[PDB]
Structures are given as structure tokens and as C-alpha cells.
Design an enzyme around this catalytic site. Structure first.
Site, mmCIF file in Angstrom:
data_model
loop_
_atom_site.group_PDB
_atom_site.id
_atom_site.type_symbol
_atom_site.label_atom_id
_atom_site.label_comp_id
_atom_site.label_asym_id
_atom_site.label_seq_id
_atom_site.Cartn_x
_atom_site.Cartn_y
_atom_site.Cartn_z
ATOM 1 C CE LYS A 106 -3.319 2.473 3.013
ATOM 2 N NZ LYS A 106 -4.268 2.224 4.149
ATOM 3 C CB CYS A 595 5.612 -7.259 -11.300
ATOM 4 S SG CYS A 595 6.552 -8.576 -12.091
#
Ligand SMILES: Cc1cc2nc3c(=O)[nH]c(=O)nc-3n(C[C@H](O)[C@H](O)[C@H](O)COP(=O)(O)OP(=O)(O)OC[C@H]3O[C@@H](n4cnc5c(N)ncnc54)[C@H](O)[C@@H]3O)c2cc1C
Ligand SMILES: CC1(C)c2[nH]c3cc(Cl)ccc3c2C[C@@]23CN4CCC[C@]4(C[C@@H]12)C(=O)N3
Ligand SMILES: CC1(C)c2[nH]c3cc(Cl)ccc3c2C[C@@]23CN4CCC[C@]4(C[C@@H]12)C(=O)N3
Ligand SMILES: [Cl-]
Ligand SMILES: [Zn+2]
EC number: 1.14.-.-
Length: 664
Positions: A106, A595
Site C-alpha cells: 500500500k 511487475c
């Protein structure tokens, strides 16, 4: 460290149940002790934070047993955590490299405000978190956070018993350090309960208030309350079709509208994993944390799942928290067969932006076992009028609760858990060192501030909740008044100076900024105006203008008075350095990336070249942090230097408070 399969092998060799393999890791043994200094009813997150903090604050002083009726750490709602919680984990020796193997990254809060009368219009308010070399926040699956803290507790001299139930009918709790007799069974059907003789009982049974309900009725605030209904969804790798501009799955995202708001939390789920295998994976992670294994040499989340025979997947937690004066059609059967499902799907098609948003997601059936596709909880907010008494105290949800919004439940709530932990040492020693009447008087007086803090804490959080809700009725008040003020009043000034010793004292001074006088002044003006407009009407434009001009007038003085140096315009996308709203502004810092292989959100920092979740080498993480406005090399070095290690405790230095400087 070479990975060990200790618990997996022990469970299979002895054909052990879930509760038995967990309880076999206890320092004192798998069976209950005859006696303890502290017995904690409940191993939800607060019972465990309490036990961990008490033990860490003064080791080898209290014998602590935590009693949990779930057979293994159970499902809980409440997944979003904040910098104070990460800092607590780090102070307890677990930093982001290890935590990110278990939990979602987060790195910001974002708010999208939907215009109800002009469908398709929205505004936004977006903040980033921090660079990876500064700190992280975490989205946590609660069965995994409660497992983590159980294992950590057992490695720090705390006994945790799963599969055991405190029997509040036959338990005796008495004052003066004389003696509690805590009855513990395996459930109602069990007619050989055990007793733990003990000095202090801690009610950590959450909203069930299983002990303090005996001492006072549940208290409700005046006015509307809230209901929540929620479920679990896939988490798309490709977030680009989400209908909100610049949307990022590594924020806690809030879709806000007159009736309430929707949370959106991206997090990994370990569901389907055997409990013993998870104990081995967690134990390995802690041994790696102990040894200081660098991030890039630590196996990724997915590699750990292969190593320990675990199940791992990405999910999105998505839920409504709406006012309970909403009018629903009587017949909602077109939308599903359960009430939670019916109200969730009905609300989605009330807003074109929510329906377009939800069409990026696929419902997961029964993620947490049968019956868990959908959840509903009604009448959220309450307070316990009594939170301590002779022989006992209460922490966490057992003191009170308001709303998911801004995640006070865990992150503000841990102020009670950690202060109670610190206070538990003198409470127990008083009872061991003085006759009964004086012990009891002294303990009572010691706890007056704790009682007083809890008493005023929940009303302040409830006023905070209402402030935000009423401003969510308008696409200017939501971002420019309520979000702005929560951020300004509640940003955690001087958090880098907190240590185990000052943690509770700091935390009880935070309260998300909800005690800041100028915050309360703006909150009361808005609530007083907006609550007079029926929910089903739009706010008059003149009312919005008046409230916005008022907020801005109070804000500019309070910001000028604050002495804390902060690059406001790098943290908030739409505000300049003096916290003035700027209509076009998009510029700010960039701390994270997705990613390209697995979709997981990652922190940018030069020593983490591989994705921590799937291990794929960031092509060459040339992707460094973007500071906007820029920082020099020296200024960047300075920033990271401040957050490396918490300072040693200095009993002569005074605590610097998180809240803005007073105007004098
Ligand atoms: C819809 C919703 C969303 C939320 N979202 C957030 C969020 O994003 N972030 C956040 O910080 N907070 C959030 N919260 C608040 C959060 O869920 C709670 O604050 C938190 O889970 C409370 O923790 P606890 O340890 O006090 O209680 P719990 O986690 O409820 O645990 C209490 C434990 O006591 C045990 N117990 C009960 N009776 C007995 C007995 N007789 N013997 C032994 N054990 C017993 C239960 O098994 C349970 O494990 C949310 C709440 C709601 C309703
Ligand atoms: C204070 C922190 C924890 C914080 N607390 C917030 C609350 C809300 Cl509501 C929104 C954003 C933040 C942030 C972002 C910050 C701002 N700080 C600048 C120097 C170090 C730090 C710490 C961090 C940083 O890098 N990002
Ligand atoms: C400020 C005081 C009154 C205080 N106020 C609290 C509130 C909560 Cl919620 C928890 C702890 C405290 C303390 C303990 C303190 C911390 N100070 C460090 C330097 C002098 C002093 C004064 C004292 C000290 O020795 N102990
Ligand atoms: Cl939050
Ligand atoms: Zn990856």
C-alpha cells in the site's frame, strides 16, 4: 537460512488437528498453564498486538496466555493498515522486505467522488505513500497477519492457544491483584473446562465485547449509522480500463458518493494452504528477518508457496459502507438471492461509474469457505461505556468502533492495545506488592487516563466519520474540505522518532488528527449544514460555496501556524505546497511500479531489482523514484537517513506530537 519443514512434518507424524499443531509451538507447552499473570481473551489482531507489545516493552516480566476460540487464525474484515502500523512492525523487528512477502503493498490513498445527479462526472483526491527506503503501508489478509503475530508471539515467550474458548459464564474476575479464575473450554459442549489463575484479564474479543458487555450496555451515537456489504474479486493485472484517470491498485481506493463509499483493496490471499505448512513458511520468514537476508536474496511470495506447498493468489477486497437511512426497493430479488449480494449489486447499478468500475472484476465464490461469497454487517458504530475495572481491561474493538473509512479500527485502535500493554506491567506488580484495597485504588487511579482516553476517543472518531460522509455528498467538499483536512490534521509528524518506548504515548496523541481543534471546527460547520438537507436531495450550490470558503479560511491559518516541513505538492496530486487546490495539477512523486510479469505492485529502490512477489527480475530496475519537485542527491540521502533506524530511547527527550503546531 536453510528452510525447515518442522511443523508440516510434526503435523503429519502425529496426525495433528489445526489447533494442535499451532499450540505445539507454545513456549510453555500445548496444554493450558495452571496460572498466568495475564490472560487475553481473543487472538484477533489487537489481542496479539497487545501481547507482543507488552512482552517487547519489558521482556521476561509477565507470563501471558492468549485464548482464541477459532481453531486457526480466522477470517476478519479490516485489511488496510497505515504508516503507524508498519512502524510498529518494524520496531518489532519485521521490515518491509519480509512483510511484503506476506501482504500487499500500500503506497497511497485515493478518493473518487461520483456526482449522483450528473452520472459519469467525478472528481478525485490522491496522495502517494513514501519511497521504499522510507517506509511502506500494507494490505493484510487477516488470517495471515494473525498467524504472523501468533508465531512471533510464541517466539517471544507468549503462549497462544487456538481452539479454546473463554467461558464468560463461569469465569471469575476480581480486583486488588487478588486473583482471576479464567475458565477455558473447547466450547459449550465441553464439561472439563480448565481454569487459569491469573492477575489480569484483557478483553480482546472485539465487537462481541464478551466481558465488558457485562459491565455496561452497548452505547450508540445519535443519528444515522452505517451498514456494510462486501465480497472478494479477482485482481486484474491490466488496470488501464478502470474508468478513473490515473487509478493505481497499490492505493486504498475509495469510490465516494452521497449514500456512502466503496473500498477497494488489492491484496494477496493464502487461502487453501494447510496451517502447518504456513507455520513453516512464516517461521522461515522470521528466521530470514532475524538474519537480515536482503530482499533480492529472499524467495518471492510465489517461490515460498512452491517451497512450503502453499496456495497463493491475488484478490481484490471490494465493499460498500453506506448510511442506514438509505431507502431500498422492497423487492431486490432481481439482484441475487442473499441480502448482502442483493444490496451490493443493486448499489452498483445505481452509479454508471461503479458499474463500469466493477466490470473490470470477477466475483470469487466462497474465498473463505462455504457461505463467504458475500458478507453483510449492520449498525457498525458503537462504544463500550466501561473499558476497565478490578482485575480487567478492554482493548481494540471491545472498546468501540466506528467505520472502515481511514482504517481507524486497526491503526487508531492499536493505541489502546499498546497503551494497555505498557500499563499491564505496573498493574500486575501493584497487585503483587501491596495489600488488596490499596492495590485496587492505585490501579483504578492509574487507569483513569486510559478510561478517559477511550471515552472521548470513539465520539471523536464518530464525528470524523460523519464529517467525511456529509462532504462525500459533493464533488468539491469531498476532496477539498474533508480529504484535505484529514490529511493535514492526521499526517504523522515525527513518526521517524518513535520507538518501542514512546510508541503508545505517540499513538494516543494521533487519533488521525480528529482531536485537532481547527479540524473539529470545520467538521462541525459542515455537519451542521449538510445534515439539514435530506439524503435524496443534492446540496444547494450556495451551501457548497459557503462551506468551501469557510474551510479554506480556517485552513490557511492553521497551515501557516504548522512548523513541520513537508513537500505537500509532491504528496497530493492536486494541491500546491501551501495546500491550496490547483485545478489542473497532476504532478507528484512516483514511488511504485507494477511487475510486468505478475501485476504485483512494487516499491522503487535500487537494492530491490526483482519483483518480491513472483521473482521476475525488473528488466534492470533503472526505474528509480521520481521526485517532483526534484530533490538533490544530498536531499535524497538525508531523507533516507532519517528513516533507517528508530532512535534509542531517551528518557529526557520529550515526545514530538504527530498533530499540527498550535497557533500560540
Ligand atoms: C466492513 C468493515 C471494514 C473494515 N475495514 C477496516 C480497514 O480497512 N482497516 C482497519 O484498520 N480496520 C477496519 N475495520 C475495523 C476492523 O475489522 C476491526 O477494528 C478489527 O478487526 C478488530 O480487531 P480485534 O482484535 O479488536 O477483534 P477481532 O479481530 O474481531 O477478534 C476478536 C477475537 O475474539 C475471539 N473470541 C470471541 N469470543 C471469544 C471467547 N469466548 N474465547 C476466546 N476467543 C473469543 C474471536 O474468535 C475473534 O478472533 C473494518 C470493519 C468493518 C466492519
Ligand atoms: C508521513 C508519512 C508516513 C505520510 N503520512 C500520510 C498520510 C496521508 Cl493521509 C497521506 C500521505 C502520507 C504520508 C506520506 C509521507 C510524507 N513524508 C515525507 C517525508 C517522509 C514521508 C513519510 C510519509 C514520505 O516519504 N511520505
Ligand atoms: C508527559 C508525561 C506527563 C506523560 N504523559 C503521558 C501520556 C500517555 Cl497516554 C502516556 C505516557 C505519558 C507520560 C509519561 C512522561 C513522558 N515524559 C518524558 C519526559 C518527562 C515525562 C513526563 C510524562 C516522563 O518522565 N514521563
Ligand atoms: Cl486507509
Ligand atoms: Zn512479479
Amino acid at each position: 537460512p536453510t528452510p525447515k519443514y518442522t511443523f508440516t512434518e510434526r503435523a503429519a507424524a502425529g496426525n495433528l488437528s489445526d489447533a494442535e499443531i499451532l499450540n505445539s509451538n507454545n513456549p510453555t507447552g500445548s496444554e493450558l498453564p495452571d496460572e498466568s499473570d495475564v490472560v487475553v481473551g481473543g487472538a484477533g489482531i489487537h489481542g496479539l498486538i497487545y501481547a507482543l507489545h507488552a512482552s517487547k516493552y519489558k521482556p521476561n516480566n509477565l507470563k501471558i496466555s492468549v485464548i482464541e476460540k477459532n481453531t486457526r487464525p480466522g477470517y476478519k474484515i479490516g485489511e488496510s493498515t497505515l504508516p503507524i502500523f508498519y512502524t510498529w512492525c518494524k520496531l518489532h523487528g519485521i521490515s518491509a522486505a519480509y512483510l511484503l512477502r506476506l501482504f500487499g503493498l500500500k503506497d497511497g490513498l485515493s478518493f473518487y467522488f461520483l456526482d449522483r445527479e450528473n452520472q459519469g462526472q467525478y472528481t478525485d483526491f490522491s496522495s502517494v505513500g513514501a519511497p521504499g527506503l522510507v517506509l511502506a503501508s500494507l494490505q493484510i489478509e487477516r488470517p495471515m497477519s494473525e498467524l504472523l503475530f501468533t508465531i512471533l508471539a510464541q517466539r517471544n515467550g507468549v503462549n497462544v492457544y487456538h481452539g479454546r474458548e473463554v467461558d464468560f459464564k463461569s469465569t471469575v474476575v476480581q480486583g486488588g491483584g487478588q486473583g482471576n479464575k479464567i475458565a477455558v473450554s473447547r466450547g459449550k459442549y465441553d464439561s472439563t473446562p480448565k481454569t487459569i489463575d491469573s492477575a489480569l484479564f484483557v478483553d480482546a474479543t472485539g465487537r462481541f465485547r464478551q466481558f465488558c458487555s457485562k459491565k455496561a450496555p452497548r452505547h450508540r451515537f445519535d443519528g444515522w449509522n452505517c451498514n456494510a456489504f462486501w465480497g472478494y474479486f479477482t485482481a486484474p493485472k491490466d488496470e488501464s480500463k478502470i474508468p478513473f484517470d490515473l487509478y493505481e491498485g497499490d492505493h486504498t481506493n475509495h469510490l465516494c458518493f452521497p449514500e456512502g463509499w466503496v473500498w477497494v483493496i488489492r491484496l494477496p490471499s493464502w487461502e487453501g494452504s494447510p496451517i502447518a505448512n504456513l507455520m513453516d513458511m512464516v517461521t522461515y520468514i522470521l528466521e530470514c528477518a532475524d538474519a537480515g537476508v536482503p530482499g533480492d536474496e529472499l524467495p518471492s511470495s510465489e517461490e515460498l508457496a512452491r517451497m512450503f506447498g502453499l496456495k497463493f493468489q491475488w484478490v481484490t477486497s471490494i465493499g460498500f459502507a453506506v448510511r442506514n437511512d438509505v431507502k431500498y426497493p422492497e423487492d431486490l430479488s432481481a439482484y441475487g438471492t442473499r441480502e448482502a449480494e442483493q444490496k451490493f449489486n443493486y448499489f452498483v447499478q445505481k452509479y454508471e461509474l461503479l458499474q463500469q468500475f466493477m466490470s473490470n472484476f470477477e466475483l470469487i465464490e466462497n474465498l473463505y469457505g462455504p457461505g463467504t461469497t458475500w458478507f453483510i454487517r449492520k449498525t457498525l458504530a458503537y462504544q463500550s461505556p466501561v473499558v476497565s475495572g478490578p482485575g480487567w481491561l478492554a482493548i481494540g474493538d471491545a472498546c468501540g468502533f466506528t467505520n472502515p473509512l481511514y482504517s481507524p479500527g486497526i491503526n487508531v485502535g492499536m493505541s489502546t492495545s499498546t497503551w494497555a500493554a505498557q500499563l499491564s506491567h505496573p498493574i500486575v506488580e501493584i497487585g503483587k506488592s501491596a495489600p488488596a484495597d490499596a492495590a485496587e485504588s492505585s490501579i483504578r487511579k492509574l487507569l483513569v487516563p486510559y478510561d478517559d482516553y477511550c471515552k472521548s476517543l470513539v465520539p471523536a472518531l464518530e464525528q470524523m466519520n460523519r464529517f467525511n460522509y456529509v462532504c462525500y455528498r459533493d464533488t468539491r467538499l469531498g476532496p477539498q474540505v474533508a480529504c484535505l483536512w484529514q490529511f493535514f490534521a492526521g499526517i504523522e509528524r515525527y513518526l521517524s522518532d518513535v520507538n518501542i518506548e514512546t510508541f503508545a504515548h505517540y499513538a494516543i496523541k494521533w487519533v488521525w488528527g480528529a482531536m485537532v481543534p481547527e479540524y473539529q471546527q470545520v467538521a462541525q460547520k459542515c455537519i451542521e449544514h449538510i445534515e439539514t438537507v435530506p439524503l435524496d436531495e443534492r446540496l444547494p450550490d450556495a451551501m457548497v460555496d459557503e462551506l468551501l470558503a469557510f474551510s479554506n479560511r480556517i485552513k490557511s491559518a492553521a497551515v501557516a501556524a504548522d512548523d513541520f516541513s513537508l513537500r505537500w505538492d509532491a504528496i497530493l496530486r492536486s494541491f500546491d505546497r501551501s495546500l491550496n487546490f490547483v485545478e489542473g495539477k497532476t504532478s507528484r512523486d512516483i514511488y511504485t511500479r507494477q511487475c510486468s510479469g505478475c501485476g504485483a505492485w512494487l516499491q522503487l529502490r535500487p537494492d530491490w531489482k526483482k519483483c518480491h512477489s513472483c521473482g521476475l527480475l525488473g528488466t534492470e530496475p533503472q526505474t528509480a523514484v521520481t521526485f517532483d519537485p526534484p530533490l538533490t542527491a544530498e536531499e535524497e540521502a538525508l531523507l533516507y537517513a532519517a528513516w533507517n533506524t528508530a532512535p534509542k530511547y531517551d528518557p529526557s527527550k520529550e515526545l514530538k506530537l504527530p498533530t499540527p503546531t498550535r497557533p500560540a
